[PDB]
């Protein structure tokens, strides 16, 4: 009932055949840093050629894939993250 | 709104990734 935003679950939009719009919420904790997308083709001798977005682009698209073939993709999530050691027990006798 | 498909997320790797069958299904 007030500024309390939780986790946000990833999401999909504008799904295609042989194109899809991959879209994700960084987390504001998250570290904002250029996302790399990794995708594997199996109809294929060779794999799809990956791609940089900045991460303000939370979204990306990628096209080029081809249908009744078994796509392998990959979402990998690179992150600092925040500040660690923040409250814990310190050891003192 | 709902999607034609939607899996979820994996903890592995000592890293947060999403993986799952393949592209979006129908």
Known sequence: ???????????????????????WTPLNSSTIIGYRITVVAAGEGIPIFEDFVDSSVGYYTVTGLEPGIDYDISVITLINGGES????????? | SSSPIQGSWTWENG?????????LEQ
């Open chain 1, 1 to 23: 009932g007030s500024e309390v935003p939780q986790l946000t679950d990833l999401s999909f939009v504008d799904i295609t055949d042989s194109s899809i719009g991959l879209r």
């Open chain 2, 15 to 23: 890293k947060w990734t999403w993986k799952g069958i393949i592209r």
């Open chain 1, 85 to 93: 050691a923040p409250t814990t027990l310190t050891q003192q006798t």
